[PDB]
């Protein structure tokens, strides 16, 4: 109402805490750079009046438009015409009833949720300012459609003998807003008896869209209003969420503040990063020092050279594990999932290997095909994780050969044939032929036939089962510490708070130090690896005279040059050194003699 | 009329003044308890239903639904005096009805059954989600009074009119948006489950319309049986057959319960009471503060089978479970215990798994051949004619405590066993075959019924020579129960004179006299009967969580280290980091049965001396030398 409005233009130009005067001092600061938006922060709003909140929190749609018009008028005042309407962004943190209140009282009430968005759609257009002409008398009006009860808020009237529906929609003086129809999925840990999860639907506005990629946790605040589409028995309807503010966690397109890198620059000046991360990554893993160094260089990566001709160099690494059960080859892999920016966990069976890359289907509108799914289209930049590279006998091998070593797939199916980009990084952990007897026989028979998959991977660990009767009792001392008593929650808060790094700071950290520094190895260091390699092939061919066959080829040699590029991304030095590169071969030379044994 | 106003007085007296079985105000106690949880439900006892139908059989099977609407408004006043102002929250209550003495299948419905109470079983097929329903049609004119009050909309009939009490014109009726509450609505369609049916024929279809506080109680695939009313909706339009003088079928429901088992009862174990209110919870503490309960419970658990002790120690420990102890931002911890039996072909190993299926709360029995490599876990069923590729799981997502029989289906052993040994290792496994990348959560338990190639001692050599199952999948279990029977007389009669007496185990007072006959038939030597012992496992698992201490730990350090050392130089099958994890896990399983939250000293060496002997007793001829080390543990 007008009276209500008189009670908001007189409130969002003098609200302040103690001499900062903030809401004029950001609205001006948001009219210079074109954004046209507010962040009210409703829990901070309550200082005026509980009544004016309660005329909002009990009734909808009317309140949003009245508030928007008041803000537009104040914005107009802070100038002296090209002036668009604004949009609001609200945010609070009460608690998130996950997906349980459905119809009881939470219809058109303010609500806060948490989910994982999986499926985006293409953009669209709805109008917000029109100009309408009649057939009979050339009448001219203008009707604005701001907020919604989707369309059919108000229809085109009959007034201007005169025939009905005399009006049309011209396209010469109009404005448009875009919706999304992105689909929210439940975070799959908090509905536990035995059931599958469900899903909802949500739309939004332009100045808060395209802020999400699928594969992230998000929190979300909004309305629970109801539409009705006539494409089921009783006159029913359907639920959806009009959303207001995605004040989620980080993106997990590199814009952020300066103090986030201030401590990072204050940490990177300390030259103790490489030895301290091996403890600070996995706080519940007994040592395993050689493997732990390989995981931090996998997550960072190398570079990508598009050198001045057609071809390119595949600048990344892909580790591979195998070993006996009970030796941490599997439980380590859930640990790399949370720390990655983008991580996918399809670790089982291969899951119908043609469906790993891309899939088509008949689509219900227009009876057509296009491309929808895939386990590799969403995992660019990050890392996938799979297992069991023995009993996928059908088609796992034919589905990763083109997927690796060029990362340029193209689907030859009934519709398109397009080379969509990929920058993926694979990771796997398998089993040999029941472990023990394989390492007590002729040392082949690990992958039963093919060496051609092994030559695409580069870095291979082989763990074993010793009987060291001394350190094992410390391991038996180690597991009873974590498993009950939970003193490592209090030990790794009394050794971490000055020395170690918590689990969530690295997710902040890795996305910054990758996306800034473009490094290059030292040019005079090229004498080192060339002098290194020539005896390794001699160390190879000293074994084949013993009637021994299989695997070392040159692709691992151009992988070590990516390995020495990896820690240069860690130290963020644009040039490499020789104390740098000798520790890198120190990691690989502990996996050169593995081919001998 | 007006005499039905007195009917509410005539039953609030007849219900609330007295509850049977020596008073105690049974129905007068379960009212306030479901008021405390704020869950909008009530029950009716069948024996009370037997006594509250004497003047009401001609008001149940004659008029089932409008009798209930006047039955609903008395239950408010039955608790308004008890809980004042309870109507200010959610303003509504509706009753539910318990079991009924009919056994109708899906086939046996005629005209005489309609507009009355019905009871039928089946299975739930394809189902929809949850919508809101208008439930109060505030009608709207255009020029006259546009508020005709919130109506009472029916089922699929679209109850409206053209003009009444305002004009007689063709002005249509519209909506507006003031104070119209919503109940929900969920149309599960039902298929007849292929149990009690003359086979070799087709299934038959119905429709079920649920109601407000009965949404999503069922899961797709699981067996249910429903008690409700019958209704008709002569829509005058059908388009599979031609239009004809026919009418459809709609079954509205008042209650729903889970699958039942061993359908031979007369007065219990068909109604899921599971409601430990007064006579149970006040009692169940003194049964927990005795000194030999764990020496009494596992002896009295499976009563039909005398046998060797250690299996009943293990299989009782399996369904008692441990704890899924979460942690900070690091790796989770398995909270499950997975036994594996090994038996001679002819000992009682197929029965303990059969008996434990009843005594659990939920189960599954996928056995032998025909177990698909995917059908255990989730699978994608393809779309119908206008739909999307959705996710319809099978066995393991339904079962939280499931039972399989992986003995030696060798032709399919190389198919499915790559899909069960990652339900434990990378626990909460789900898959993305040509669909969506998701991860369901299933903290399932696994028992097994392994079977060697012939006799139990098919070799002297270790178990890799005995079973065809290889090493690493076998190491995903905790313990190997193995049986022995060569030649005896006095131990042979101890089964032989025992099992012969088991075959000798072949109206208001007389209903309870048969119930008193049910006491003595299982209380020959009186081994703590199963009328109530299963009734507290359900809150022995969802109410109590245990913890440990630190001063009682380092005795186990040499136990893991030396025994692993003693079995690498003598390598039959190894132990790893996970055996000791199972050592402390089954330790706190026993302490959960004291209802105690602690861990004593008596439970550790108990739990040690059930694993160390059961590992060593399958080695070789040289088990005799290992037993010379054995009493050093004791």
């Amino acid at each position: 109402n007008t009276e209500i409005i008189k009670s908001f233009k007189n409130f969002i130009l003098e609200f302040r805490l103690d001499s900062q005067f903030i809401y004029r001092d950001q609205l001006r600061n948001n009219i210079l750079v074109k954004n046209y938006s507010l962040t009210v922060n409703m829990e901070h709003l309550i200082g005026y009046n509980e009544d004016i909140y309660k005329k909002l929190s009990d009734e909808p749609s009317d309140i949003i438009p009245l508030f928007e018009t008041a803000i537009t008028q104040v914005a107009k005042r802070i100038s002296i015409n090209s002036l668009p309407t604004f949009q609001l962004i609200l945010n609070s943190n009460a608690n998130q009833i996950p997906l349980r209140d459905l119809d009881s009282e939470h219809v058109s009430k303010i609500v806060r949720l948490s989910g994982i968005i999986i499926s985006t759609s293409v953009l669209s257009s709805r109008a917000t300012y029109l100009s309408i002409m009649c057939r009979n008398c050339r009448h001219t009006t203008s009707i604005t459609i701001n907020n919604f009860n989707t369309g059919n808020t108000v229809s085109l009237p009959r007034s201007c003998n005169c025939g009905p529906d005399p009006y049309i929609i011209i396209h010469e003086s109009s404005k448009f807003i875009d919706q999304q129809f992105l689909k929210l999925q439940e975070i799959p840990e908090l509905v536990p008896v035995g059931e599958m999860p469900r899903n909802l639907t949500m739309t939004c506005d332009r100045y808060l869209t395209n802020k999400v990629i699928p594969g992230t946790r998000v929190t979300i605040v909004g309305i629970y209003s109801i539409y009705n589409s006539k494409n089921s028995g009783v006159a029913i309807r359907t639920p959806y969420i009009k959303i207001l503010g995605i004040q989620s966690d980080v993106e997990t397109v590199t814009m952020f503040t300066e103090e986030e890198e201030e401590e990072f620059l204050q940490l990177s000046r300390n030259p103790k990063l490489y030895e301290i991360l091996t403890n600070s990554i996995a706080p519940s893993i007994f040592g395993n020092e050689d493997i732990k160094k390989a995981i931090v260089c996998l997550l960072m990566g190398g570079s990508k050279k598009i050198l001045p001709d057609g071809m390119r160099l595949r600048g990344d690494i892909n580790v591979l594990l195998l070993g006996d059960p009970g030796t941490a080859k599997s439980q380590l892999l859930k640990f790399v999932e949370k720390v990655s920016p983008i991580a996918v966990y399809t670790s089982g069976k291969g899951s119908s290997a043609a469906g790993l890359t891309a899939s088509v289907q008949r689509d219900p509108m227009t009876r057509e095909f296009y491309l929808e799914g895939g386990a590799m289209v969403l995992a660019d930049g990050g890392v996938v994780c799979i297992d069991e590279f023995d009993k996928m006998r059908d088609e796992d091998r034919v589905a990763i050969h083109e997927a690796m070593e060029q990362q340029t797939i193209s689907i030859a199916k009934a519709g398109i044939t397009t080379v969509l980009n990929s920058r993926t990084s694979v990771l796997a952990a398998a089993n040999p032929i029941y472990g023990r007897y394989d390492d007590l026989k002729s040392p082949g028979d690990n992958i039963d036939f093919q060496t051609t998959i092994l030559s695409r991977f580069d870095m291979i660990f082989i763990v074993k089962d010793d009987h060291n009767e001394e350190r094992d009792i410390s391991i038996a001392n180690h597991v009873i510490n974590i498993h009950t008593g939970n003193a490592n929650a209090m030990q790794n808060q009394q050794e971490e708070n000055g020395s170690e790094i918590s689990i969530e700071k690295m997710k902040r950290y890795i996305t910054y130090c990758r996306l800034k520094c473009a490094p290059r190895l030292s040019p005079q260091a090229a004498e080192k690896l060339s002098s290194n390699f020539v005896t390794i092939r001699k160390q190879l061919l000293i074994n084949e005279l013993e009637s021994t066959e299989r695997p070392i080829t040159i692709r691992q040699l151009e992988a070590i040059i990516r390995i020495t590029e990896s820690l240069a991304k860690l130290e963020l030095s644009p040039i490499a050194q020789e104390r740098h590169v000798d520790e890198a071969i120190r990691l690989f030379q502990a996996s050169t003699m593995d081919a001998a044994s | 009329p007006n005499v039905s106003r007195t009917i509410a007085r005539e039953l609030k007296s007849f219900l609330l003044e007295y509850t049977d079985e020596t008073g105690r105000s049974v129905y007068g106690a379960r009212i306030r308890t479901l008021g405390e949880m704020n869950s909008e439900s009530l029950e009716v006892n069948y024996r009370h239903l037997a006594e509250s139908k004497a003047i009401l059989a001609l008001f149940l099977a004659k008029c089932p639904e409008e009798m209930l609407k006047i039955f609903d408004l008395v239950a408010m006043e039955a608790t308004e005096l008890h809980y004042p102002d309870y109507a200010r929250i959610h303003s509504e209550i509706h009753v539910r009805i318990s079991d009924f003495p009919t056994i109708y299948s899906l086939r046996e419905l005629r005209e005489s059954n309609l507009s009355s109470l019905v009871r039928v079983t089946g299975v739930v097929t394809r189902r929809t989600g949850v919508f809101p329903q208008l439930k109060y049609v505030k009608f709207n004119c255009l020029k006259c009074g546009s508020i005709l009050g919130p109506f009472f909309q029916d089922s699929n009939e679209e109850i409206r009119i053209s003009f009444c009490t305002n004009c007689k014109s063709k002005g249509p009726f519209r909506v507006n948006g003031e104070k119209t509450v919503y109940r929900n609505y969920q149309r599960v369609t039902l298929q007849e489950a292929p149990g009690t049916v003359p086979p070799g024929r087709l299934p038959r279809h119905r429709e079920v319309i649920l109601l407000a506080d009965l949404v999503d109680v069922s899961k797709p695939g699981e067996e249910v049986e429903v008690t409700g009313i019958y209704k008709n909706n002569y829509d005058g339009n059908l388009n599979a057959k031609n239009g004809f003088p026919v009418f459809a079928t709609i079954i509205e429901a008042n209650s729903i319960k889970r699958r039942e088992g061993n359908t031979a009862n007369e007065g219990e174990e068909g109604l899921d009471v599971f409601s430990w209110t007064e006579e149970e919870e006040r009692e169940f503490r003194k049964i927990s503060r005795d000194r030999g309960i764990i020496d009494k419970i596992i002896s009295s658990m499976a009563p039909s089978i005398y046998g060797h002790r250690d299996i009943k120690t293990a299989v009782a420990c399996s369904l008692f479970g441990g704890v899924p102890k979460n942690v900070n931002g690091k790796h989770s911890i398995r909270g499950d215990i997975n036994v594996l039996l090994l038996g001679d072909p002819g000992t009682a190993k197929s029965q303990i798994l059969k008996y434990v299926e009843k005594t659990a709360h939920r189960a599954v029995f996928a056995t032998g051949q025909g177990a698909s490599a995917v059908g255990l876990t989730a699978s994608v069923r393809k779309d119908p004619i206008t739909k999307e590729w959705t996710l319809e799981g099978g066995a393991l997502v339904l079962a939280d405590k499931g039972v399989c029989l992986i003995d030696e289906f060798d032709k399919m052993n190389d198919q499915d066993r790559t899909s069960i040994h990652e339900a434990m290792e990378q626990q909460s496994i789900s898959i993305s075959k040509a669909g969506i990348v998701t991860t369901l959560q299933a903290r399932c338990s696994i028992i097994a019924a392994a079977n060697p190639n012939g006799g139990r001692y098919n070799s002297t050599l270790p178990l890799a020579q005995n079973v065809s199952l290889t090493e690493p999948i076998l190491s995903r279990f905790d313990i190997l129960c193995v049986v022995r029977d060569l030649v005896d007389e006095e131990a042979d009669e101890r089964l032989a004179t025992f099992v012969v007496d088991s075959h000798v185990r072949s109206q208001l007072n007389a209903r309870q006299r048969r119930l008193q006959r049910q006491r003595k038939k299982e209380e020959e030597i009186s081994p703590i009967p199963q009328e109530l012992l299963m009734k507290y496992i359900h809150y022995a698992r969802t109410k109590i969580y245990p913890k440990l201490h630190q001063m009682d730990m380092d005795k186990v350090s040499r136990v893991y280290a030396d025994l692993r050392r003693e079995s690498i130089s003598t390598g039959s099958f190894p132990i790893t980091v996970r055996h000791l994890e199972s050592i402390l896990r089954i330790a706190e399983s026993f302490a959960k049965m004291r209802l105690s939250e602690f861990v004593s000293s008596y439970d550790l060496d108990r739990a040690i001396k059930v694993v160390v002997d059961s590992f060593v007793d399958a080695q070789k001829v040289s088990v005799r030398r290992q037993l010379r080390r054995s009493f050093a543990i004791y």
């Binding site: 609200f15 302040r16 805490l17 103690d18 829990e43 309550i46 200082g47 509980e50 909140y53 309660k54 929190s57 609070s92 943190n93 009460a94 608690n95 998130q96 009833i97 209140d101 009282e105 939470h106 009430k109 303010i110 609500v111 008593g485 939970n486 003193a487 209090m490 009394q494 708070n497 | 008021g35 405390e36 949880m37 704020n38 809980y83 929250i89 913890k547 201490h549 630190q550 001063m551 939250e597 602690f598």
Partner: protein, 293 residues
């Protein structure tokens, strides 16, 4: 901490008020779900149903708390109270305000390790004295969020020792020796220990018409058996006609004069001393005979 936090959370320390009545762990979640459950509490706008919507709901508490007069007799809840405001930014009263200062004094960080421990409490003291002006605001809330978990932390062993049933009524006092449970590290500083006793004096705040004596506890975290043992005061259930002060400090002069083998009074308050492990067992043996009340 109600106007800061969630009227929900009373869920823990309303059982403290039922420990002020009769119970702590057995029946409370079976008991509490009528009075403090006028709804299964809605979490839609709950941040302003303990801020704002309680205009109608805590005024219903204004008309509940005279019909909960008789419901359990639980009248250690009505208090006159006092409050301050700021002009904006929400009200803050003075009842919860002293609670933040105590907890923030705790956290916020041979025989040579004690110097690096004795210098910690003086340092974290200093980040509280500054918290009395508007020149700092945004760390006052840090004590608020560190209030409502440490109480959950201090309870997490109090329910353990109460169901351990290791409180031995010897003749006059009751002896409890917390040897080692979990989470032992939060008991070096003495200010948590008086609160732990303040919860532990209330579990024995039933009738107890005879034997109204407070207890003496014991704990250890570090080397050479420091054992910052302490005593309490008995408490009246608000019916002082006999102002009982202390009987222990009189006897504390005796045992610091008789044995003289690693006994200390170096800690400041006389209600807290130190004792060695092989001397704390003959500590009570001179105390069970010396009746000095």
């Amino acid at each position: 901490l109600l106007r800061h936090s969630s009227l929900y959370d009373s869920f823990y320390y309303s059982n403290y008020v039922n420990a002020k009545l009769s119970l702590w762990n057995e029946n409370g979640k079976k008991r509490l779900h009528k009075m403090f459950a006028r709804m299964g509490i809605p979490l839609s706008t709950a941040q302003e149903t303990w801020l704002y919507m309680d205009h109608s709901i805590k005024r219903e508490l204004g008309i509940i708390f005279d019909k909960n007069l008789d419901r359990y007799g639980l009248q250690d809840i009505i208090r006159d109270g006092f409050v301050r405001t700021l002009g904006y930014r929400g009200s803050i009263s003075a009842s919860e305000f002293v609670e933040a200062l105590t907890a923030l004094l705790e956290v916020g960080n041979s025989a040579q390790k004690l110097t690096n421990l004795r210098k910690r409490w003086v340092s974290n003291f200093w980040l509280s004295w500054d918290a009395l002006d508007d020149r700092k605001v945004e760390l006052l809330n840090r004590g608020i969020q560190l209030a409502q978990d440490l109480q959950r932390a201090i309870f997490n062993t109090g329910v353990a020792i109460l169901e351990k049933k290791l409180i031995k009524h010897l003749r006059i006092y009751r002896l409890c020796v917390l040897q080692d449970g979990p989470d032992l590290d939060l008991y070096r500083n003495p200010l948590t220990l008086l609160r732990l006793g303040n919860w532990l004096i209330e579990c024995c705040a039933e009738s107890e018409d005879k034997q109204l004596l407070p207890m003496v506890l014991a704990s250890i975290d570090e080397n050479t058996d420091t054992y910052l043992v302490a005593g309490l005061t008995p408490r009246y259930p608000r019916g002082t006609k006999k102002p009982i002060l202390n009987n222990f400090s009189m006897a504390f002069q005796q045992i610091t004069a008789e044995t003289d083998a690693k006994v200390r009074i170096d800690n400041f308050e006389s209600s807290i001393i130190e004792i060695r492990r092989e001397d704390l067992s003959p500590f009570l043996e001179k105390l069970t005979l010396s009746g000095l009340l």
